[PDB]
Design a protein around this ligand. Structure first.
Ligand SMILES: Nc1nc(N)nc(-c2cc(O)ccc2O)n1
Length: 294
């Protein structure tokens, strides 16, 4: 692109590298993502284009889609910091509960909007949740996984995180439901509260086994159909479920209650974003302003 001027590289997504750029025209500063391949799929540039209409205050706005020279550039609004960075910065002290509750509340509104438009994220994680000084938090990279498909690593040599991957995906399901996003968000919710990733797997089986060790190895009782899943093995060790009081202390009972419904094994039983918004946990929700040092 000749219009912009790569101010800085603000990260390396799984679908390409993201740059902060100043538009020599509008002068506006935006986030410029260079996607990945012999010319980029055509069904892809059509799916992505549809997301320009998926506008919501809790969804990073996709300003433009430019397919040129068999290269794909996505232009997004720019936010100054991602949640992973804010958590690392807040670890010594921990993000205050009121601000954790506000972010979760906003993320669920974002998901509710996307899910109502039959759009799933599929790859939610702290690194693509963006915050601003006004206390807002927004979902980035929505719909990208759909158009494309998470490969071995990423666009290039660099491991993709599995820490937030729903169990049905790890067990080989072919069709993903909106429930996969709820699972990811529950994982992020727990990480904000405890200041440590909930299920930091370093391999697919390790990821699954970390989930089993904490929530109990799933069976036909809690998850009808699970033993019929593609990657399910009768040889999986049988671990007992641990109490949530031990999983996310010292989170209160409303919080633990909501988290438990967000981490139900059966995707059909997992709480929807719409319903999570009505949970007693958000009875006293407010919108605190974060402390960002840009
Ligand atoms: N890691 C990181 N940091 C910052 N500050 N921003 C972004 C960002 C990522 C996107 O995909 C879109 C817009 C953005 O502002 N990503």
């Amino acid at each position: 692109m000749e219009n912009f001027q790569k101010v800085e590289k603000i990260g390396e997504g799984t679908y390409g590298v993201v740059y902060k750029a100043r538009n020599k025209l509008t002068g506006e500063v935006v986030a410029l993502k260079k996607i990945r391949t012999e010319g980029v799929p055509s069904t892809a540039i059509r799916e992505i284009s549809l997301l320009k209409e998926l506008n919501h205050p809790n969804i990073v706005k996709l300003l433009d889609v430019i397919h040129t020279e068999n290269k794909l550039y996505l232009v997004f609004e720019f936010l100054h910091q991602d949640l992973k960075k804010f958590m690392d910065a807040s670890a010594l002290t921990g993000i205050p509960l009121p601000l954790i509750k506000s972010y979760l509340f906003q993320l669920l509104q974002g998901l509710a909007f996307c899910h109502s438009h039959r759009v799933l994220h599929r790859d939610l994680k702290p690194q693509n949740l963006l915050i601003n000084t006004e206390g807002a938090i927004k979902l980035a990279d929505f719909g990208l996984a759909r158009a494309f498909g998470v490969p071995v690593r990423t666009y290039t040599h660099e491991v993709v995180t599995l820490w937030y991957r729903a169990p049905e995906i790890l067990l080989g399901c072919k069709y993903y439901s909106t429930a996969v996003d709820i699972w990811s968000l529950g994982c992020i919710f727990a990480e904000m509260v405890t200041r440590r990733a909930l299920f930091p797997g370093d391999s697919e089986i390790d990821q699954l086994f970390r989930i089993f060790r904490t929530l109990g190895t799933p069976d036909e009782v809690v998850w009808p159909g699970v033993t019929s899943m593609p990657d399910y093995k009768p040889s999986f060790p049988k671990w007992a479920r641990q109490d949530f009081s031990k999983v996310v202390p010292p989170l209160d009972e409303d919080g633990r209650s909501l988290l438990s419904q967000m981490l139900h094994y059966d995707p059909n039983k997992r709480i929807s974003a719409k319903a999570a918004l009505a949970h007693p946990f958000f009875q006293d929700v407010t919108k605190p302003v974060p402390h960002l040092r840009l």
